Every structure is written in structure tokens, then in C-alpha cells.
């Protein structure tokens, strides 16, 4: 059975600049008979099914913009995006149809590089409703920032927390090419009611110095 191997596994390219993704087949997918490469490229945007970009290694699908082009033959193929746009953020897969099963590449995450943008920080105390259950969830939101890397420090009365919080990050936005992040501090009702000042400190490249949002338990 044929094996597809893409390279790189992931790729970060600035707006309006070339992005190149490579696909390699264990055997040739050129059919000598009709001289056609049985090789397609698919785009998969988050939480959508894959869209066909390019078939017979170099033929662009209708609707697919000019900047997408395919090339190569036999065992070595190349998807190229000549002038990368915000909306091109996706995972790109090559797929061979010389055999069936018509096997896929492992995929290539394409990220858009843009000028650094600082996160808007918001903090959220636990709901009165949640406390009745016996645990407390404090939520810090970093909203619409680039790049993806950010440090979130939880401070409970100036004591720095560790191993009691979890982060989630959005898929990169297809318009402003930014991310958002949620840090969730989880403690018991007991521990939440002992302490007074709950603070979330955010270190990020787009901020001249760490930003802190905090509340005192019960306004």
C-alpha cells in the first residue's frame, strides 16, 4: 500500500508571502497509460469537511483563487500559495488515487504570521450558582492576540498558583489572523472562600509589561 509523507508538518508564513508544502509518495502515481498524476490537494478549515483545491497534481478546481497552484510528477509534488491571505489558515492534505485505499498525507498546519497584537484581558469570578455545587471556577480571557505564545499567572492573595488551572486556545481567526485563550483556575468552595484577591497576570510579546486583571471576592 502507498504511503504519503508531507513536509513540513506545520508552517508559519507572513501575509502576502509564498507558502510551499511538499508531498512524497512511496511509489509513483504517474499512470504511463494516460500520463496523468493521480494526486489531489485538499484544504480543511476548522470544523468543516475537506474542500478539493487541485487535481491531476496541477489542475486548479473552479472557485479556488489564482494564488493556489500545484506542481511535481511521479513521487514529488508541491502545493504553492503565491500571496498568502488571512483566510488561507487551514490544514492542507495531499491524497493519492493511483491505488485504493486512496491514502492521505498526515497533513500540514498553515498559520498566518502578522504584526504582534496585544490581548484584551478580562477576569470572571465564579457564579453564585456554581458555588452551591462545592467547586469554584475562575476564568481569565485573553482576547484577539498574535502570536499564540502567552504566559498566564494565577495569583490568590499574591500567592502564585500551579497545577490547578487549564488553558484552551481558539483556532486562528480567518479574518484578523489572531488567537484567543481561556485560563480556568479550579479550587474547592472552602479554598475559594478562605482568600480575598483573585488576579490573572498576562505576559505577552505585544505588551510593554505584564497586564493584571483581578477582583475581591463579593465585589
Amino acid at each position: 500500500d502507498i504511503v504519503m509523507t508531507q513536509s513540513p508538518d506545520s508552517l508559519s508564513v507572513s501575509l502576502g508571502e509564498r507558502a510551499t508544502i511538499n508531498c512524497k509518495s512511496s511509489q509513483s502515481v504517474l499512470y504511463s497509460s494516460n500520463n496523468k498524476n493521480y494526486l489531489g490537494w485538499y484544504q480543511q478549515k476548522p470544523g468543516q469537511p475537506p474542500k478539493l483545491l487541485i487535481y491531476w497534481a496541477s489542475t486548479r478546481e473552479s472557485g479556488v483563487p489564482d494564488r493556489f497552484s500545484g506542481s511535481g510528477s511521479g513521487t514529488d509534488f508541491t502545493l504553492t500559495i503565491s500571496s498568502l491571505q488571512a483566510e488561507d489558515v487551514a490544514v492542507y492534505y495531499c491524497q493519492q488515487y493511483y491505488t485504493t485505499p486512496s491514502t492521505f498525507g498526515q497533513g500540514t498546519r498553515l498559520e498566518i504570521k502578522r504584526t504582534a497584537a496585544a490581548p484584551s484581558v478580562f477576569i470572571f469570578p465564579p457564579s453564585d450558582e456554581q458555588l452551591k455545587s462545592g467547586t469554584a471556577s475562575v476564568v481569565c480571557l485573553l482576547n484577539n492576540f498574535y502570536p499564540r505564545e502567552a504566559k498566564v499567572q494565577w495569583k490568590v492573595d499574591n500567592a502564585l498558583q500551579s497545577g490547578n488551572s487549564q488553558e484552551s486556545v481558539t483556532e486562528q481567526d480567518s479574518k484578523d489572523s489572531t488567537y484567543s485563550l481561556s485560563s480556568t483556575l479550579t479550587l474547592s468552595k472552602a479554598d475559594y472562600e478562605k482568600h480575598k484577591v483573585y488576579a490573572c497576570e498576562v505576559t505577552h510579546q505585544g505588551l510593554s509589561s505584564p497586564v493584571t486583571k483581578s477582583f475581591n471576592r463579593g465585589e
Binding site: 492521505f104 470572571f124 455545587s133 484567543s180 479550579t186
Partner: protein
């Protein structure tokens, strides 16, 4: 073109499940039908294929002997019977379509069906407000905590509010239950003048909750 996907959800290892896509608006017997799956976070995997008249059937080695592909061109329906299910079969299962040998490139019809194979019990989400406080921009949201399995859907004001929304990916907690927050940024001035409600739906626990989110 209109598609109806059904089957899917929670099933325990060894048990079985029947997926189906049905469609109107395309000539159902002009196409070879395929199932592609994607284990969450990982990449695409060719699973199964079937010729227009059920003449030739091909399975990937991973599923051979366990899964049965079939179709009814009269009912414009593609079926996948999942037997002897195992944790690794947990994936989004997609319906795909190819014309012929002259053009065997996949068209995907239908959005994918989540199968979760696990011994763990279903548990509905606890929905809690993330209330806004006191440039003129305010964030508010819903905390959708301690549910199983995936997925939950979150909308705002029943689909009327889509601008500004970030529904975070589920994260598994050490408890073995998922949690996420859905948040939205709005003008400060609107906080008192406009109503904000999360529409959380969790099909597996039969939980529909519309939670009002107001200042404090």
C-alpha cells in the same frame, strides 16, 4: 442539495452502531460512495468505498472484518455498520462521493458524524454565567462544565449573535469530563439595554439549557 446525517454518539467497546447519510439534489447512483474518518486532533483516514451499483467494496485494513459499507440508491442513502468497536475508532466519520475512474477525486457531502467509543457514562453539562463587571468593551460568556461525551453546541440569542463569539475547544479535566467556555465581546453601553442568552445543547444527555447572563 440537502443531506441528513444520523447514527453516532456514545457507544461502549465491543457494541455496534449504524451511521447513514441520505441526500436529495444530486443523482445518487452517478457516484462511488466513500467513508473517511478523522480521530479528534489527528488527520484524515480512508475507511471504506463502494461502486454505484454495490459491485465492488473495499475496506482499509484497520476496519476489515468489523465495518460493513452498503447503500440503497432508491432511498438515496449511504450506510456504515460499525461492529466490534474499539477506542481508536473514536472519530468524526465523513460521507464522500466520486464520479468514476476518469475522475476519482472526493466531494464531501455532510459535515461529519462524531462516534465516541468509551465505557464512561454520559453526563450533561452544568452551564454557569461568566458575568461582565461594573475601551468601552465588555466580555461575558457561559461556562459549560463537567460533561461527557463530546459534543456540545453553543449559540447566543438563538443564532442572532455570531459577531464577537469565541466558543473554546473542549478540554478533558482529570475528572474524565470535558469543560469549555463560550464568550463574546460587546459594547459596554449595550450591557443593560440588550439580552444575552447561551443556547447549550448536549444531544447525548438530552440537555437543552438557555442560560441568561447579566451583570454582577
Amino acid at each position: 442539495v440537502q443531506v441528513v446525517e444520523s447514527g453516532g454518539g456514545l457507544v461502549q467497546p465491543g457494541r455496534s452502531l449504524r451511521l447513514s447519510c441520505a441526500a436529495s439534489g444530486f443523482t445518487f447512483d452517478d457516484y462511488a460512495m466513500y467513508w473517511v474518518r478523522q480521530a479528534p486532533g489527528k488527520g484524515l483516514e480512508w475507511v471504506s468505498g463502494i461502486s454505484w451499483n454495490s459491485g465492488s467494496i473495499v475496506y482499509a485494513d484497520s476496519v476489515k472484518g468489523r465495518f460493513t459499507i452498503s447503500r440503497d440508491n432508491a432511498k438515496n442513502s449511504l450506510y456504515l455498520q460499525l461492529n466490534s468497536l474499539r477506542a481508536e475508532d473514536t472519530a468524526f466519520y465523513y460521507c464522500a462521493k466520486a464520479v468514476s475512474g476518469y475522475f476519482p477525486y472526493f466531494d464531501y457531502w455532510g459535515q461529519g458524524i462524531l462516534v465516541t467509543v468509551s465505557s464512561a457514562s454520559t453526563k450533561g453539562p452544568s452551564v454557569f454565567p461568566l458575568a461582565p463587571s461594573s475601551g468601552g468593551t465588555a466580555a461575558l460568556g457561559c461556562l459549560v462544565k463537567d460533561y461527557f461525551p463530546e459534543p456540545v453546541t453553543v449559540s447566543w440569542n438563538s443564532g442572532a449573535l455570531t459577531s464577537g463569539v469565541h466558543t473554546f475547544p473542549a478540554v478533558l479535566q482529570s475528572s474524565g469530563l470535558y469543560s469549555l467556555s463560550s464568550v463574546v465581546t460587546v459594547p459596554s453601553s449595550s450591557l443593560g439595554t440588550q439580552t444575552y442568552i447561551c443556547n447549550v445543547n448536549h444531544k447525548p444527555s438530552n440537555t437543552k439549557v438557555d442560560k441568561r447572563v447579566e451583570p454582577k
